[PDB]
Amino acid sequence: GFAWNVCVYRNGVRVCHRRAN
């Protein structure tokens, strides 16, 4: 699969998402 959770700090909060490249 392509399940890589890219967690980033957006306006203070760390948000995790799956990079759909």
Tab-separated table of N, CA, C and O in Angstrom:
chain	number	residue	atom	x	y	z
A	1	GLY	N	0.830	-1.232	0.000
A	1	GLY	CA	0.000	0.000	0.000
A	1	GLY	C	0.846	1.255	0.000
A	1	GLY	O	2.052	1.192	-0.236
A	2	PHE	N	0.226	2.390	0.272
A	2	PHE	CA	0.942	3.655	0.342
A	2	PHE	C	0.601	4.369	1.640
A	2	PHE	O	0.518	5.595	1.701
A	3	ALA	N	0.411	3.586	2.686
A	3	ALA	CA	0.015	4.130	3.965
A	3	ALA	C	1.219	4.668	4.730
A	3	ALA	O	1.831	3.964	5.535
A	4	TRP	N	1.550	5.918	4.464
A	4	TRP	CA	2.543	6.633	5.243
A	4	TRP	C	1.900	7.847	5.884
A	4	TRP	O	1.402	8.741	5.193
A	5	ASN	N	1.892	7.867	7.203
A	5	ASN	CA	1.241	8.934	7.937
A	5	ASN	C	2.180	10.110	8.115
A	5	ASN	O	3.117	10.066	8.911
A	6	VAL	N	1.929	11.155	7.354
A	6	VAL	CA	2.706	12.372	7.434
A	6	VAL	C	2.070	13.316	8.446
A	6	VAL	O	1.067	13.973	8.157
A	7	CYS	N	2.626	13.341	9.643
A	7	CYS	CA	2.126	14.205	10.701
A	7	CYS	C	2.906	15.510	10.731
A	7	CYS	O	4.135	15.508	10.827
A	8	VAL	N	2.194	16.619	10.650
A	8	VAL	CA	2.826	17.931	10.614
A	8	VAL	C	2.144	18.880	11.582
A	8	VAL	O	0.976	18.700	11.920
A	9	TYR	N	2.878	19.884	12.027
A	9	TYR	CA	2.363	20.841	12.982
A	9	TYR	C	1.764	22.032	12.254
A	9	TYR	O	2.486	22.886	11.738
A	10	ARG	N	0.443	22.083	12.215
A	10	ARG	CA	-0.257	23.120	11.483
A	10	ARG	C	-0.955	24.055	12.457
A	10	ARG	O	-1.961	23.688	13.058
A	11	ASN	N	-0.393	25.247	12.627
A	11	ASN	CA	-0.952	26.256	13.531
A	11	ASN	C	-0.916	25.765	14.977
A	11	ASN	O	-1.766	26.128	15.790
A	12	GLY	N	0.067	24.931	15.286
A	12	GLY	CA	0.237	24.454	16.642
A	12	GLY	C	-0.127	22.991	16.812
A	12	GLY	O	0.467	22.299	17.640
A	13	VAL	N	-1.071	22.507	16.020
A	13	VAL	CA	-1.562	21.144	16.178
A	13	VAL	C	-0.913	20.191	15.186
A	13	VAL	O	-0.785	20.488	13.999
A	14	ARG	N	-0.485	19.050	15.694
A	14	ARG	CA	0.086	18.009	14.873
A	14	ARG	C	-1.016	17.196	14.216
A	14	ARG	O	-1.768	16.486	14.887
A	15	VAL	N	-1.118	17.316	12.905
A	15	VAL	CA	-2.126	16.602	12.148
A	15	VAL	C	-1.490	15.482	11.331
A	15	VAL	O	-0.464	15.680	10.679
A	16	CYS	N	-2.083	14.304	11.393
A	16	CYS	CA	-1.586	13.161	10.650
A	16	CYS	C	-2.485	12.866	9.460
A	16	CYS	O	-3.710	12.887	9.567
A	17	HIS	N	-1.864	12.612	8.322
A	17	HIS	CA	-2.589	12.298	7.100
A	17	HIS	C	-1.796	11.330	6.247
A	17	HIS	O	-0.589	11.185	6.421
A	18	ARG	N	-2.479	10.675	5.331
A	18	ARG	CA	-1.833	9.719	4.443
A	18	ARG	C	-1.490	10.401	3.128
A	18	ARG	O	-2.386	10.828	2.395
A	19	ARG	N	-0.199	10.524	2.843
A	19	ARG	CA	0.243	11.195	1.622
A	19	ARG	C	-0.174	10.407	0.386
A	19	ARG	O	0.348	9.325	0.111
A	20	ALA	N	-1.104	10.967	-0.358
A	20	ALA	CA	-1.624	10.323	-1.551
A	20	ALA	C	-0.935	10.874	-2.789
A	20	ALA	O	-1.494	11.701	-3.513
A	21	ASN	N	0.286	10.424	-3.019
A	21	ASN	CA	1.059	10.871	-4.166
A	21	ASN	C	0.851	9.924	-5.340
A	21	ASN	O	0.092	10.279	-6.266
